């Protein structure tokens, strides 16, 4: 199809090298973040998401880190092997600036499911690094009453992991710290380009990809749209189609649909 670099980027914070698929195309990049059952060695964005074909030759780099399954692409309080906020917001962009000549900031983050959450959280709390956040079937309001219980249940069922070790027990209130719904005001006032896609049905061809809780991603995305507008957000694109799978059958073509918007934002 098209050669790309299979980078092994050191993550001092996680204590191992992270596989990162990298297609050079310019100083600014789009970081692609996997669904919950993420490819350990190669991102599902490359294989099922058709990312390199869709985005090649458009004047931006493509960056797709692997190995982030059942992580919410965040820093875990009790898991040293899951420090994805530090890696994605600091170690990776610093490595690419030092070793592949990319700009420090003005990048895009785009993802599905946990990757949709991850993209929105990265831009909210690190606007210096990401001027664009795109979310497909994303859990954009994880601290929500029903959602936090749903994420905990699904992460244990499909991933065998305890989310108490991620952001503490949710009763302690720290899930709100990392929540882009709660901190939608950051996204609005920083003028981040936001792109949100979520069908108004809970269908998921691969249940593990949505940890069996696609209905919560559906509701989270709708509530994020209302919250974003209510805090003065005015640089967003929202699409809530009646039909469509919460899975790669829809996510792959949706990357093509938003590609022009990514390029307009970061190149």
UniProtKB/Swiss-Prot annotation:
GO terms for molecular function: acyltransferase activity, transferring groups other than amino-acyl groups. One of its GO terms (cellular component) is extracellular region. InterPro entries: AB_hydrolase_fold, Esterase-like, Mycobacterial_A85_antigen. The keyword rRNA-binding does not apply. The keyword Zinc-finger does not apply. Keywords: Acyltransferase, Secreted, Signal, Transferase. It is found in: Secreted. SUPFAM superfamilies: alpha/beta-Hydrolases (SSF53474). It holds the Pfam family Esterase. May have a role in host tissue attachment, whereby ligands may include the serum protein fibronectin and small sugars. Homodimer. Belongs to the mycobacterial A85 antigen family. This is MPT51/MPB51 antigen. The lineage of its organism: Bacteria, Bacillati, Actinomycetota, Actinomycetes, Mycobacteriales.
């Amino acid at each position: 199809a098209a050669p790309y670099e299979n980078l092994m980027v050191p993550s001092p914070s996680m204590g191992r090298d992270i596989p990162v698929a990298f297609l050079a195309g310019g100083p600014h990049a789009v970081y692609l973040l996997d669904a919950f059952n993420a490819g350990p060695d190669v991102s599902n964005w490359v294989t099922a998401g058709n990312a390199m074909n869709t985005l090649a030759g458009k004047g931006i780099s493509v960056v797709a880190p692997a190995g982030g399954a059942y992580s919410m692409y965040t820093n875990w309080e009790q898991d040293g092997s899951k420090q994805w906020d530090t890696f994605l917001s600091a170690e990776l962009p610093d490595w690419l600036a030092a070793n592949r000549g990319l700009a420090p900031g003005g990048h895009a983050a785009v993802g599905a499911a946990q990757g949709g959450y991850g993209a929105m959280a990265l831009a909210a709390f690190h606007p210096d690094r990401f001027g664009f956040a795109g979310s497909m079937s994303g859990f954009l309001y994880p601290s929500n009453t029903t959602t936090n219980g749903a994420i905990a249940a699904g992460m244990q069922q499909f991933g065998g992991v305890d989310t108490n070790g991620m952001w503490g027990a949710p009763q302690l209130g720290r899930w709100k710290w990392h929540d882009p719904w709660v901190h939608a005001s950051l996204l609005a006032q920083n003028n981040t380009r936001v792109w949100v896609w979520s069908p108004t049905n809970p269908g998921a061809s691969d249940p593990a990809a949505m940890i069996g809780q696609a209905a919560e991603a559906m509701g989270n995305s709708r509530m994020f749209y209302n919250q974003y507008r209510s805090v003065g957000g005015h640089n967003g694109h929202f699409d809530f189609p009646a039909s469509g799978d919460n899975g790669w059958g829809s996510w792959a073509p949706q990357l093509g649909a938003m590609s022009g918007d990514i390029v307009g934002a970061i190149r």
